[PDB]
């Protein structure tokens, strides 16, 4: 019937069309007959002036306000004239102009993506809104050139996705900034921009690592209660709770190790809580584990080997063996007497021992094997001059400070018959009473020795002599046990000299005789 095309948002009084002459009616007819024009929507967008008989724009025309995002827009206007009654229906189609730019819901939007997020994972992103319809509507999206991310759009309606091309890391890149540009295909060309500032969330993917797998620490033997050994330090590359670690022992530690050593969980300092002995254990090997606070927590392992240094804290324990009581006087030099065994609990320089004895002593000490010493006899010996020795043996434990261990040994010398029984002085003379009764003691001879026991035993005897052959009698009788001389005859008148022999009882028996004389002629 009739179609008019009018551009959106036109100048006031914009020429639409000569509707008057188009319907075969003159202005002259238009003036008297009642001219009515009615339309839907606003109905005041267009109006006709009768003076020149034309149709024109009165107010601003917003197509998107009336028809929204619909493909076709047309305004139905009816024209009524009276006397006579006549009605004509005319439709005016509104043309869309690119006056509406691509508008994003927000200029700035921040997204949060985990670090451990794998590739091919897409993230939903809201598109820009546009009230325009057709070619002058947004169709082209352009993402900033980035290494990690790429853009993806469904060909149809559906939120566009952001795909992770390269893996992300918090430590390398804490924050990532991108810009998304949406451009519509219209004249003039309009701009849409949204800047995305995405922050990388820390994921516990860094295990705690020590400086080296093994550490070596020297430790004294007699360290007091609560002595520091070493503090271990672990490095972690995460943030906050994932970045700090607690130190602890491994579950495979020995009971003794746990008994002697302890570690503070927070500090990671190793302190001694038990008496450690070098003789008990020379060194300790301790496995250590450190764990962070993150839920997927990773452990860090390192083993400390501590060595205990031997301090001279034990005196050289020695034992006297093979106790030999007798030592003969005639013993030639080079004869062993007793045995000595010296041992030391300590080890090393303060483990070796040097033994010695009294210098003012004929005996000398010499060792044959290891720390076993044998007491050998040197120089000559005499029982009578010196009876017994009480030798004190000193054992020196080297190192600083040096220790001492002494032993008292009692050794006695055995008597050997090498002396002879000697009377006081030769010779002896006595004078007996004239009328001498029988069985009367006249004199008691005496002898003394230097030896002991049977070697010092004096046995008195008499000699026979020629005068005995002269036949007076068996004369005097002597007592071997006492040395008393007994007479059994009255003296008569008609020089007596006889030898009294005192002897020993030892196996090499030795004796001497003294001359005793009696003179009687009364």
Ligand X SMILES: *[C@@H]1O[C@H](CO[C@@H]2O[C@@H](C)[C@@H](O)[C@@H](O)[C@@H]2O)[C@@H](O[C@@H]2O[C@H](CO)[C@@H](O[C@@H]3O[C@H](CO[C@H]4O[C@H](CO)[C@@H](O)[C@H](O)[C@@H]4O)[C@@H](O)[C@H](O[C@H]4O[C@H](CO)[C@@H](O)[C@H](O)[C@@H]4O)[C@@H]3O)[C@H](O)[C@H]2NC(C)=O)[C@H](O)[C@H]1NC(C)=O
Ligand Y SMILES: *[C@@H]1O[C@H](CO[C@@H]2O[C@@H](C)[C@@H](O)[C@@H](O)[C@@H]2O)[C@@H](O)[C@H](O)[C@H]1NC(C)=O
Residue numbers at the binding site for ligand Y (CB under 6 A): 211, 225-226, 233, 235, 273-275
> What CA–CA distance (Å, rounded) separates 451 from 414?
10
Which of 13, 134, 159, 348 binds a copy of itself (CB under 8 A)? It is 159
The answer to whether the beta carbons of residues 26 and 65 sit under 8 Å apart is no
Partner from Ca ion, ligand NAG, ligand X, none binding residue 363, C-beta < 5-8 Å depending on class: none
Q: Which is nearer to ligand NAG, 459 or 512 (CB)?
A: 512
Cis peptide before 427 (omega within 30 of 0): yes
Which of 181, 227, 235, 331 binds ligand MAN (CB under 6 A)? It is 181
Contact string (CB under 8 A) for a copy of itself, positions 94-133, x = contact: -----------x--------x-xxx--xxxx-x-------
Q: Among the candidate windows 48-56, 106-114, 242-250, 435-443, which touches Ca ion by CB under 5 A? A: 242-250
Q: What share of the chain is helix, strand, coil (3-state, %, to 5)?
A: 5, 40, 55
Element (H, E) at 179: strand 175-184
Nearest Cα to Cα of residue 46 among 20, 72, 10, 100: 10
| 266 touching ligand X, by CB under 6 A | no
In the bound complex, what is the minimum distance in angstroms from residue 374's beta carbon to ligand MAN? Answer: 20
Q: Which residues, numbered 1-60, are part of the site for Ca ion (CB under 5 A)?
A: none
Tokens standing for residue 345: 């609990």
For the chain, how many residues are written? Answer: 522
Contact string (CB under 6 A) for ligand MAN, positions 100-139, x = contact: -------x--------------------------------
Which of 225, 332, 400, 435 binds ligand X (CB under 6 A)? It is 225
In the bound complex, what is the minimum distance in angstroms from residue 383's beta carbon to ligand MAN? Answer: 20
Partner from ligand MAN, Ca ion, a copy of itself, none binding residue 277, C-beta < 5-8 Å depending on class: Ca ion
Which of 241, 273, 392, 414 binds ligand X (CB under 6 A)? It is 273
> Which residues, including other chains, have CB under 8 Å from residue 385's CB and lie 6 or more apart?
none
Taking CA atoms, 357 is separated from 106, 320, 354, 364, 368, in Å, by: 104, 14, 11, 8, 17
Q: Which residues, numbered 474-503, are part of the site for ligand NAG (CB under 6 A)?
A: 499
Cis peptide before 401 (omega within 30 of 0): yes
H-type alpha helices, 168-244: none
The bridge status of strand 372-376 relative to strand 364-369 is antiparallel
Q: Which is nearer to Ca ion, 198 or 432 (CB)?
A: 198
> Which residues, including other chains, have CB under 8 Å from residue 406's CB and lie 6 or more apart?
392, 393, 394, 395
Sign of CA dihedral 63, 69, 71, 77: negative
Q: Which is nearer to ligand MAN, 106 or 228 (CB)?
A: 106
> What CA–CA distance (Å, rounded) separates 48 from 218?
109
Q: Which residues, numbered 348-407, are part of the site for Ca ion (CB under 5 A)?
A: 350, 382-384, 397
Strands (DSSP E) contained in 330-458 are 336-343, 353-356, 364-369, 372-376, 388-397, 403-414, 422-423, 428-430, 440-444, 447-448
- Other C-beta atoms within 10 Å of 134: how many? 11
Which of 14, 195, 227, 374 binds ligand MAN (CB under 6 A)? It is 195
- DSSP assignments along 2-49, one per residue: -EEEEESSPPTT-----HHHHTT--HHHHTTS-EEEEESTTS-SEEEE
Residue 182 CB-density burial (10 A; 0-12 exposed, 13-18 middle, 19+ buried): buried
| 177 touching a copy of itself, by CB under 8 A | no
Strands (DSSP E) contained in 15-148 are 35-39, 46-49, 54-57, 74-81, 86-95, 108-109, 112-114, 122-125, 138-143
Q: Among the candidate windows 50-58, 306-314, 443-451, 467-475, which touches ligand MAN by CB under 6 A? A: 443-451
Q: Among the candidate windows 13-21, 23-31, 287-295, 462-470, which touches Ca ion by CB under 5 A? A: 287-295
Which of 21, 59, 193, 322 binds ligand MAN (CB under 6 A)? It is 193
Q: Which is nearer to ligand NAG, 128 or 462 (CB)?
A: 462
Question: What is the side-by-side order of every strand in the sheet holding 353-356?
Answer: 326-328, 403-414, 388-397, 353-356
Partner from ligand Y, a copy of itself, ligand MAN, none binding residue 235, C-beta < 5-8 Å depending on class: ligand Y
Q: Which residues, numbered 205-244, are part of the site for a copy of itself (CB under 8 A)?
A: 205, 207, 213-214
> Total residues contacting a copy of itself (rule CB under 8 A)?
52
- DSSP assignments along 462-517, one per residue: E---HHHHTTS-S--EE-TTT-EEEE-S------EEEEEEEE--SSS--EEEEEEE
Partner from Ca ion, a copy of itself, ligand X, none binding residue 369, C-beta < 5-8 Å depending on class: a copy of itself
Partner from ligand MAN, ligand NAG, Ca ion, none binding residue 513, C-beta < 5-8 Å depending on class: ligand NAG
Q: Which residues, numbered 338-397, are part of the site for ligand MAN (CB under 6 A)?
A: 392
| 364 touching a copy of itself, by CB under 8 A | no
Partner from ligand MAN, ligand NAG, ligand Y, none binding residue 9, C-beta < 5-8 Å depending on class: none
| 459 touching ligand NAG, by CB under 6 A | no
Q: Which is nearer to a copy of itself, 241 or 463 (CB)?
A: 241
The answer to whether the beta carbons of residues 334 and 380 sit under 8 Å apart is no
> Total residues contacting ligand MAN (rule CB under 6 A)?
14
| 250 touching a copy of itself, by CB under 8 A | yes
**Residue ranges that bind ligand NAG, judged by CB under 6 A:** 499, 512-513
**Residue ranges that bind ligand X, judged by CB under 6 A:** 225-226, 273
**Residue ranges that bind ligand MAN, judged by CB under 6 A:** 107, 179, 181, 183, 189, 191, 193, 195, 392, 406, 408, 444, 446, 448
């Amino acid at each position: 019937q009739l179609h008019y095309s009018v551009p959106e948002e036109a100048k006031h009084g914009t020429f639409v069309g000569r509707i008057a002459q188009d319907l075969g009616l003159e202005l002259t007819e238009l003036v008297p007959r009642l001219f009515r024009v009615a339309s839907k929507d606003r109905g005041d967008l267009l109006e006709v002036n009768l003076q020149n008989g034309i149709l024109f724009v009165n107010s601003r025309i917003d197509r998107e306000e009336l028809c929204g995002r619909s493909a076709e827009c047309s305004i139905h206007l009816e024209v009524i004239v009276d006397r006579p009654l006549q009605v004509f229906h005319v439709e005016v189609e509104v043309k869309d102009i690119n006056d509406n730019p691509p508008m994003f819901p927000a200029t700035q939007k921040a997204l949060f993506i985990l670090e451990s997020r794998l590739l091919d994972s897409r993230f939903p992103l809201e598109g820009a809104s546009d009230a325009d319809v057709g070619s002058n509507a947004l169709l082209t999206y352009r993402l900033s050139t980035n290494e990690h991310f790429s853009l993806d759009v469904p060909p149809n309606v559906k939120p566009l996705g952001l795909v992770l091309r390269k893996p992300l890391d918090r430590e390398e890149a804490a924050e990532i900034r991108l810009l998304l540009t949406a451009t519509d295909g219209g004249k003039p060309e309009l701009t849409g921009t949204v800047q995305l500032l995405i922050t990388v969330l820390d994921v516990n993917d860094n295990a705690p690592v020590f400086d080296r797998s093994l550490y070596t620490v020297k430790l004294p033997e007699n360290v007091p209660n609560g002595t520091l050994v070493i503090k271990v330090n672990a490095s972690d590359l995460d943030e906050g709770v994932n970045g700090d670690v607690m130190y602890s022992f491994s579950s495979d530690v020995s009971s003794d190790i746990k008994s002697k050593f302890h570690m503070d969980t927070v500090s990671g300092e190793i302190t001694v809580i038990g008496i450690i002995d070098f003789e008990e254990s020379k060194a300790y090997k301790i496995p250590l584990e450190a764990r962070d606070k993150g839920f997927p927590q990773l452990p860090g392992h390192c083993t400390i080997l501590v060595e205990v240094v031997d301090a001279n804290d034990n005196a050289p324990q020695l034992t006297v063996s093979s106790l030999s009581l007798p030592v003969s006087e005639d013993s030639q030099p080079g004869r062993v007497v007793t045995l000595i065994s010296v041992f030391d609990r300590d080890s090393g320089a303060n483990g070796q021992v040097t033994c010695s004895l009294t210098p003012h002593i004929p005996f000398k000490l010499v060792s044959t094997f290891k720390n076993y010493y044998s007491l050998v006899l040197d120089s000559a010996l005499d029982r009578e001059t010196i009876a017994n020795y009480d030798v004190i043996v000193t054992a020196r434990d080297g190192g600083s400070p040096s220790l001492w261990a002494t032993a008292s040994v009692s050794v006695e010398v055995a008597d050997v018959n090498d002396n002879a029984p000697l009377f006081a002085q030769p010779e002896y003379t006595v004078f007996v009473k004239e009328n001498n009764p029988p069985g009367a003691h006249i004199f008691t001879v005496s002898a003394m020795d230097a030896d002991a026991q049977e070697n010092a035993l004096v046995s008195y005897s008499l000699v026979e002599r020629r005068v005995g052959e002269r036949l007076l009698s068996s004369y005097v009788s002597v007592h071997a046990e006492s040395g008393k001389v007994f007479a059994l005859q009255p003296l008569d008148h008609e020089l007596l000299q006889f030898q009294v022999s005192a002897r020993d009882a030892g196996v090499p028996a030795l004796g001497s005789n003294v001359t005793l004389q009696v003179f009687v002629l009364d």
